[PDB]
Specification:
Order of helices and strands of chain A: EHEHHEHHEEEEEEHEHEHEHEEHHHHH
CATH class of chain A: Alpha Beta
Organism (chain B): Homo sapiens
Largest interface: A-B, 74 and 72 residues
GO molecular function, one term (chain B): magnesium ion binding
CATH topology of chain A: Isopropylmalate Dehydrogenase
Largest sheet of chain A: 10 strands, mixed
Catalytic activity (chain B): D-threo-isocitrate + NADP(+) = 2-oxoglutarate + CO2 + NADPH
Pfam families (chain B): Iso_dh
Oligomer: homodimer
Bound molecules: NADPH dihydro-nicotinamide-adenine-dinucleotide phosphate, ligand QWM
Number of domains of chain A: 1
Radius of gyration of chain A: 23 Å
Subunit structure (chain B): Homodimer.
Helix content of chain A: 40-55%
């Protein structure tokens, strides 16, 4: 039938294997059924170098303008990759630039298929982890104490008066290490607002984990800010949807997440959520099933992408003309989450139906027995997987396109 | 008939339900078969308040003297229990005093029973977690920044050399929080030595998790100290037992433990291991299956105990004469680990055999379907647990005693 009017969507192309999969997704799953007003920005390392990383800021401002962006996995430069593509500078992570310009919080969620076993058996519903990516250990000032001496940390108000001196330690036996770290009230407030809005959107309870029994001033501030914002702006909206917010001790938090069935938002400090990420990805199965959504404190602008990288090994294989089996679920769901938020903003029933139908097609295709090699490894175990247990990248994309056409034709019966 | 010669052992008596189970373990499992030279010390809160915590120092020094101590779970006073017992001072945790006097490191391990389900699928062997319980967030100065201003951190050498001032942050809009924390070289060195000695004692590889990709100076110190001590004093000893040591990112370490099957020593910083403890005990099953061993850097002195507490709720039920189902496996294994180290130091063949036999009897008794209520809930799920699925405390202790007598009598019967 007719194409669904999508609206303004900021698209950002990426690098390598995820870029090939991105083109496949656009050609076979989106454009045949959706007419979009695309604002494309090639965030590949090639075009990010030729523009001195201006295209990244342009795409971030386009997201600020149009409230919804979908992003392909991009190469983050390091020492070896500057020599690989012969770059000028070692440009910063595009994800970090977009995160700073937008000022939101990233939430990771695993896509569940009933036939894909999980390392934590009881997990039935997703555990959406929101990660405060500012300050703490990641903006700290650490140094080696080489000998006996005094380590103090001081606070001096801007007008110069009434300095407060906190004696950290007095080394009289050899040396050791010391460090000071900080965090901002504004960043914590943005983090709390994003977490509350994410919980209200997903319709799930919200938990914040700290160690305020030990760090009574430091983590107590996180607890206080979350509680103030909750009681003043979100309590009634939570109780209406029969959800709730609670502060938890990080010990209790990881324990209860270990023995729960899932289905909640978990707001973590920088170190905690960063330590998680990989582990939750492992516990749910494959990285190709993990999506990320950057939500802003206003709850209006959303930037969706896959939580995995560009899958460099599979691209290295694909360059030689070898058979690859790369999971596209996370990128497809980046597209579907972007389109679903677009439909919510535009009051678009057809686009909402299409995005949900694409998610259902993906999950049903996997649950019926068609999957890539990583999910087949989750089922059978890596050494026991054979070529007949999975489809390759292009075979799986073809199957998804077939089933999507079938379901959207049944949207006319 | 004749008992086994056990040697010198420092015993520390405890509080409440673990004290009851402690007396039961001594009466039914240890004393009938082993004659010990027991240096006993009552670490009950009553006696501890009567002597102003001096019995704790005495017991720690006795452990330092005799190299082996077995400890019952003790009450760490707080706001409530000072009023409960009419305490003079709010006495410090006995575990902390003993640890600081001995200068060792605590290693926690869960006891596996093949019929007890685990929350992580592939877990077959135990993951022994070593906790560096000093410094970092647990000895930090944290504070609220009420408004704009500088937060700096300075190092002032005591010899007289130049000060060093680093900028932590400059608050220009609003305020926030700040904190300073530290660690010490000798503490990290003792931590490393205890971890290496523990790995050599268990015959398992050792992994040290840090975040030195972010804190290149702070955690890099841990990495460098561990590597220096390993290369200088334990490389060939590790290679002989076909084991290894490795540094790991905390991310990769948690994920590896996720998809691992177990069988390695995991040395953690304060925050890491402290956060892990409860979740690890939950993932392997019940808390009553969790043991801890205090291992000193010299590798000579060892102090075993249960990882759980005095189980206060079960003790309240016991006081009112109600039926309880407390798991004694952790305290039994405290005794068996103490006796195993005793037999290792004294080359005591028979005592080592007895300790291993008691551990085997415990594991086999549970695997035969005779368990306390917590393991029964691990199998069936707490709501689906009926009275016929488990035994109470004294029934379980009596069954253990019967099976132990049978095993030792058949060991003599063989020859
Ligand atoms: N969102 C972003 O823009 C991000 C980008 N990156 C960038 O990506 C690049 C590659 O990073 P890398 O370390 O390889 O990590 P990746 O996440 O790209 O992949 C690492 C491994 O995970 C498995 N894997 C990940 N995604 C998939 C998938 N969709 N389907 C199947 N298997 C998958 C593969 O395992 P196996 O080898 O067993 O097949 C792969 O080798 C780097 O330049 C990095 O900077 C990294 C993180 C986030
Ligand atoms: N090693 C030591 O000396 C330690 C001592 N303590 C002290 O112990 C006291 C009580 O501590 P608490 O908070 O109750 O923690 P506990 O570890 O004593 O027990 C808490 C709960 O865990 C379960 N549990 C623990 N051990 C067993 C066991 N052997 N068999 C069956 N279930 C068990 C019970 O759950 P349920 O109610 O569901 O049956 C119990 O109610 C406090 O005064 C504390 O300071 C605390 C920690 C360590
Ligand atoms: C996903 C998983 N999370 C989790 N698990 C564990 N240990 C379990 C026993 C192993 C991994 C299997 N340890 C941490 C962990 C470790 C260090 C620091 C932090 C902090 F920084 F976040 F505080 N967290 N995290 C939940 C338990 C399912």
């Amino acid at each position: 039938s007719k194409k669904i009017s999508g609206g303004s969507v900021v698209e950002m192309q990426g690098d390598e294997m995820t870029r090939i999969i991105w083109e496949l997704i656009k050609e076979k799953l989106i454009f045949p059924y959706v007419e979009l007003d695309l604002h494309s920005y090639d965030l590949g390392i090639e075009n990010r170098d030729a523009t001195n990383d201006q295209v990244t800021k342009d795409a971030a401002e386009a997201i600020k303008k149009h409230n919804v962006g979908v992003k392909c996995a991009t190469i983050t430069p390091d020492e070896k990759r500057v020599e690989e593509f012969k770059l000028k500078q070692m440009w910063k992570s595009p994800n970090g630039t977009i995160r700073n310009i937008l000022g939101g919080t990233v939430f990771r969620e695993a896509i569940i298929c009933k036939n894909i076993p999980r390392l934590v058996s009881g997990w039935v519903k997703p555990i959406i982890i929101g990660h405060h990516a500012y300050g703490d250990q990641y903006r700290a000032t650490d140094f080696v104490v080489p000998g006996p001496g005094k380590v103090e940390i001081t606070y001096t108000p801007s007008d110069g008066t009434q300095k407060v001196t906190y004696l950290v330690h007095n080394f009289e036996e050899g040396g050791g290490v010391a460090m000071g770290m900080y965090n901002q009230d504004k960043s914590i407030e943005d983090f709390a607002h994003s977490s509350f809005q994410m919980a209200l959107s997903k319709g799930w309870p919200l938990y914040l984990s700290t160690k305020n029994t030990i760090l009574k001033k430091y983590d107590g501030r996180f607890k206080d800010i979350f509680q103030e914002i909750y009681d003043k702006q979100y309590k009634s909206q939570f109780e209406a949807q029969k959800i709730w917010y609670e502060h938890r001790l990080i010990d209790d938090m990881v324990a209860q997440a270990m023995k729960s069935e899932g289905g909640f938002i978990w707001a973590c400090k920088n170190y905690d959520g960063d330590v998680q990420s990989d582990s939750v990805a492992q516990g749910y199965g494959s990285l190709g099933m993990m999506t990320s959504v950057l939500v802003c404190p206003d709850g209006k602008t959303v930037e969706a992408e896959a939580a995995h990288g560009t899958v460099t090994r599979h691209y290295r294989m694909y360059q030689k003309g070898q058979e690859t089996s790369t999971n596209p679920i996370a990128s497809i769901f980046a597209w579907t989450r972007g389109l679903a938020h677009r439909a919510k903003l535009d009051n678009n029933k057809e686009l909402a139906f299409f995005a949900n139908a694409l998610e259902e097609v993906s999950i049903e295709t996997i649950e019926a027995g068609f999957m890539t090699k990583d999910l087949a490894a989750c089922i059978k175990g890596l050494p026991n997987v054979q070529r007949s247990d999975y489809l390759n990248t292009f075979e799986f994309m073809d199957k998804l396109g077939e089933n999507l056409k079938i379901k959207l034709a049944q949207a006319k019966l």
